[PDB]
Amino acid sequence: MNTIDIAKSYITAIQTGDHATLGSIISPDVIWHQPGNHQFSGTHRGMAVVGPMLGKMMEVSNGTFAISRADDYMASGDWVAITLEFSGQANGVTLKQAGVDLLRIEDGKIVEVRLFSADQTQEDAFWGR
Amino acid sequence: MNTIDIAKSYITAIQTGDHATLGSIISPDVIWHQPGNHQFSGTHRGMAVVGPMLGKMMEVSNGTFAISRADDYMASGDWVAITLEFSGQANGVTLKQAGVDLLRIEDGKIVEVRLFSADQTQEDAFWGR
Numbered sequence: 001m002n003t004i005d006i007a008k009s010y011i012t013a014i015q016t017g018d019h020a021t022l023g024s025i026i027s028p029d030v031i032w033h034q035p036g037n038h039q040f041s042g043t044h045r046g047m048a049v050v051g052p053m054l055g056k057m058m059e060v061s062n063g064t065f066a067i068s069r070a071d072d073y074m075a076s077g078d079w080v081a082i083t084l085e086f087s088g089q090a091n092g093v094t095l096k097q098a099g100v101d102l103l104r105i106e107d108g109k110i111v112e113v114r115l116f117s118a119d120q121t122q123e124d125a126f127w128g129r
Numbered sequence: 130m131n132t133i134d135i136a137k138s139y140i141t142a143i144q145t146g147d148h149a150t151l152g153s154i155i156s157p158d159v160i161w162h163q164p165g166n167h168q169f170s171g172t173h174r175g176m177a178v179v180g181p182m183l184g185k186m187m188e189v190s191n192g193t194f195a196i197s198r199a200d201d202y203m204a205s206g207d208w209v210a211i212t213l214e215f216s217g218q219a220n221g222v223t224l225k226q227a228g229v230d231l232l233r234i235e236d237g238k239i240v241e242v243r244l245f246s247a248d249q250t251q252e253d254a255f256w257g258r
């Protein structure tokens with residue numbers, strides 16, 4: 001079992017809303033870097049913070065924020081880049097754009113997450129203040 | 130002038146073979162992570178090493194290794210992810226595949242590079258041993 005397997009499990013769990021997997025395969029000490037200039041932007045540390053933030057995100061997006069398509073999983077050292085599309089409809093914003101999730105995986109767990117968006121102005125409006 | 134501007138300058142310079150730009154906008158102390166299992170794979174530090182390695186790469190690929198298409202430039206903290214396609218024809222291998230370049234940019238310079246390839250088996254064969 002390799003880092004791409006773990007990354008695929010992570011994406012499948014996001015896509016299918018499997019909180020059990022997400023709560024288990026993400027490190028309790030996860031460092032999560034969310035880009036941009038909206039209420040969830042910044043670096044967050046620990047599932048104590050990240051779990052509730054993911055929940056608030058689901059609330060703010062009326063459950064519509066989604067990785068609508070995953071394209072490629074690529075490994076480099078302990079990192080995996082996943083190229084993808086995400087979408088959503090909330091705060092009057094129709095979100096549809098390319099992104100990349102960067103995951104750092106160690107000992108079977110995602111220890112660091114850095115997200116990238118192709119249109120950060122649109123994503124910022126989506127999440128809101 | 131922002132990190133995406135620097136990333137675009139970097140990609141344009143690779144694409145047009147502008148060694149002057151590359152030699153100037155890449156940090157002398159650049160940390161360069163090349164994935165896979167071929168003769169250039171591993172982490173390399175310093176332009177004293179990276180410059181000559183880029184030259185050897187051009188030689189090994191008969192000057193054909195190319196970023197054939199750049200798709201999106203995305204910023205997250207001091208990192209920029211560039212989704213792209215690369216191609217080449219060398220060592221009996223026709224290379225054509227998606228990739229992502231991750232650049233860390235500080236004070237106007239690229240200080241760290243991490244490359245990702247969609248088909249590392251094919252890229253490994255391309256570069257060879």
Ligand SMILES: [Cl-]
Binds near residue numbers: 068
């Ligand atoms: Cl998908």
Ligand SMILES: [Cl-]
Binds near residue numbers: 089091093
């Ligand atoms: Cl809406």
Ligand SMILES: [Cl-]
Binds near residue numbers: 197
């Ligand atoms: Cl292009």
Ligand SMILES: [Cl-]
Binds near residue numbers: 218
């Ligand atoms: Cl050939």
